[PDB]
Amino acid sequence: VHKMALLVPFRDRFEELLQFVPHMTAFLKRQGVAHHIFVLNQVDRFRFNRASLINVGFQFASDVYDYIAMHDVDLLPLNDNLLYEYPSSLGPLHIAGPKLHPKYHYDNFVGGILLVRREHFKQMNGMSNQYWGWGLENDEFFVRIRDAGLQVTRPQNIKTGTNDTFSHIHNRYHRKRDTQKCFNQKEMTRKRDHKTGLDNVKYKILKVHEMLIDQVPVTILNILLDCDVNKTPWCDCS
Ligand SMILES: O=c1ccn([C@@H]2O[C@H](COP(=O)(O)OP(=O)(O)O[C@H]3O[C@H](CO)[C@H](O)[C@H](O)[C@H]3O)[C@@H](O)[C@H]2O)c(=O)[nH]1
Ligand SMILES: O[C@@H]1[C@@H](O)[C@H](O[C@@H]2CO[C@@H](O)[C@H](O)[C@H]2O)OC[C@H]1O
Ligand SMILES: [Cl-]
Ligand SMILES: [Cl-]
Ligand SMILES: [Mn+2]
């Protein structure tokens, strides 16, 4: 039996989380996937850093989890044929493929829901830490996948399409995307990051909370990320 660490980078998405937990738990129980949900709550006051939270969650998750799912909290599978299985030796298994995602349709999109073996994640030194605020972190990770000699696989013979494979309950005016650029964020985050990753993410876990949501156990990690403003000053544009 494989076990999946279901990693949910998180800040101020409480109602999303209330829908997320019962839905994913039922969904995964139906296909027999053993798993645990880790809410990666970024409690520092820097801009949202999804990828660094993933790195922290990977470090925290015990050895029993031999793969991880990096998972948006607002993106729910509607098709039971989307198998959250242990990825093959080829590399990561991308569940929310561009032919299936309601919004993102470019070929190398690996955002939303991406399953990665422990060994492969380690092999790539996890995700880049330089992505403060919305965007690009998954795209650079795609390059990390190619550079590691791995490939992305996606489920075949899925019959649903872009409008009926996932619900993406995300109103752009309610949950705003932090797309601000300051300092030379534009230039720096558009290039491959060979310098940061799993092995040097800087952080403290202030608190671990064990939460039951209608009987389903879920772990909350209160994560205080560090920002080195000598390297990534765009962690805060205030
Ligand atoms: O202030 C935030 C911002 C994001 N999130 C979490 O991060 C996830 C992804 O963020 P968004 O939903 O705001 O962004 P998108 O809907 O545009 O999703 C896509 O854009 C992101 C770019 O950063 C990621 O690549 C993401 O996986 C990809 O599906 C959210 O679902 C949520 O789980 C928060 O919890 N709080
Ligand atoms: O992090 C990813 C974003 O970088 C990505 O942004 C896309 C970049 O190319 C543009 O043509 C697209 O319109 C734009 O969405 O979107 C997905 C996100 O995961
Ligand atoms: Cl890039
Ligand atoms: Cl494919
Ligand atoms: Mn979203």
Q: How far is residue 206's CA from residue 226's CA, in Å, rounded to a whole number?
A: 12
Closest CA to 30 of 100, 93, 79, 94: 79
Cβ-contact 113, 95 below 8 angstroms: yes
Report the pocket of ligand 2 as residue ranges, CB < 6 Å: 104, 109, 111, 135-139
Stated resolution in angstroms? 2.2
Q: How far is residue 108's CA from residue 34's CA, in Å, rounded to a whole number?
A: 28
73 lines ligand 1 (CB under 6 A): yes
Give me the helix-helix angle, 50-60 and 137-147, nearest 10°. 60
Closest CA to 187 of 130, 229, 225: 130
Which tokens sit at 210?
Answer: 């064990």
Q: How far is residue 181's CA from residue 183's CA, in Å, rounded to a whole number?
A: 7
Cβ-contact 73, 10 below 8 angstroms: yes
Q: What is the CATH number of domain 1-238?
A: 3.90.550.10
Coil, strand or helix at 22: helix
Cα distances from 35 to residues 29, 71, 102, 138, in angstroms, run: 9, 13, 26, 23
Any idea where the domains of the chain sit in the sequence? 1-238
74 lines ligand 1 (CB under 6 A): yes
List all residues 6 or more positions away from 82 whose beta carbon is below 8 Å from its beta carbon.
95, 100, 155, 158, 165
Cα distances from 156 to residues 102, 120, 150, in angstroms, run: 18, 22, 18
Cβ-contact 90, 97 below 8 angstroms: no
**Which regions of 141-238 does DSSP assign to beta strands (E)?**
166-168, 203-213, 216-225
DSSP state of 139: H
List strands edge to edge, sheet with 203-213: 93-94, 113-117, 67-71, 4-10, 35-42, 216-225, 203-213
> How determined?
X-ray
Among 41, 50, 115, 177, say which to mutate for ligand 1: greatest number of ligand atoms within 8 Å of CB: 50
Query: At residue 141, what is the residue type?
Result: F
Q: How far is residue 70's CA from residue 115's CA, in Å, rounded to a whole number?
A: 6
